[PDB]
Swiss-Prot record:
Highest classification ranks of the organism: Viruses, Riboviria, Orthornavirae, Pisuviricota, Pisoniviricetes
Taxonomic source organism: Coxsackievirus A16 (strain G-10)
Quaternary structure note: Homodimer.
Name under which the protein is recorded: Protease 2A
Catalytic activity: Selective cleavage of Tyr-|-Gly bond in the picornavirus polyprotein
Function of the protein: Cysteine protease that cleaves viral polyprotein and specific host proteins. It is responsible for the autocatalytic cleavage between the P1 and P2 regions, which is the first cleavage occurring in the polyprotein. Also cleaves the host translation initiation factor EIF4G1, in order to shut down the capped cellular mRNA translation. Inhibits the host nucleus-cytoplasm protein and RNA trafficking by cleaving host members of the nuclear pores. Counteracts stress granule formation probably by antagonizing its assembly or promoting its dissassembly.
Active site: 15, 33, 104
Positions contributing to Zn(2+) 1 binding: 50, 52, 110, 112
Length: 139
């Protein structure tokens, strides 16, 4: 689990969105595994606006942060799970590192701020849903 709080927005993995997230929906995209809902309280996470390919992510299944090199956001095939059939997930970045399904929502950050959240993995590869292109999160 995990979310990003920026301004009057909350960003979460779409497959983990709650009834309240859907009742206050701003935007969702199944192909990216993202959903953004509105909040009353003001969030103060900073979103990175860059093309970094190195950063640190939080791994709840190890209670540890790990530095990684990651690919640029791209369309990657993702095997079926109980939340989606087999499909291409867009805006996804992979890195070599540990993750388990419950690790979704862990944040990946570079020196410029939040880059994305854990969304896929397996076979020693962790995948992050990018949020750097959602410029509207800052207004
Ligand atoms: C985060 N992670 N680390 C290992 C691993 C193995 C399997 C999965 C399967 N999966 C894929 C997600 C998607 N974005 O399509 C939806 C939720 C989910 O359980 C995730 C995994
Ligand atoms: Zn950066």
């Amino acid at each position: 689990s995990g979310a990003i709080y920026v301004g009057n927005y909350r960003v979460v993995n779409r497959h983990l969105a709650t009834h309240n997230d859907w009742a206050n929906l701003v935007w969702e995209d199944s192909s990216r595994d993202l959903l953004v809902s509105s909040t009353t309280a003001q969030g103060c996470d900073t979103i990175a606006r860059c093309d970094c390919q190195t950063g640190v992510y939080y791994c709840s299944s190890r209670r540890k942060h790990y530095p990684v090199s990651f690919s640029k956001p791209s369309l990657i095939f993702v095997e079926a799970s109980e939340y989606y059939p087999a499909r291409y997930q867009s805006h996804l970045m992979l890195a070599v590192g540990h993750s388990e399904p419950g690790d979704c929502g862990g944040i990946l950050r570079c020196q410029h701020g939040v880059v994305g959240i854990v969304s896929t993995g397996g076979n020693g590869l962790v995948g992050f849903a990018d949020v750097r292109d959602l410029l509207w999160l800052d207004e």
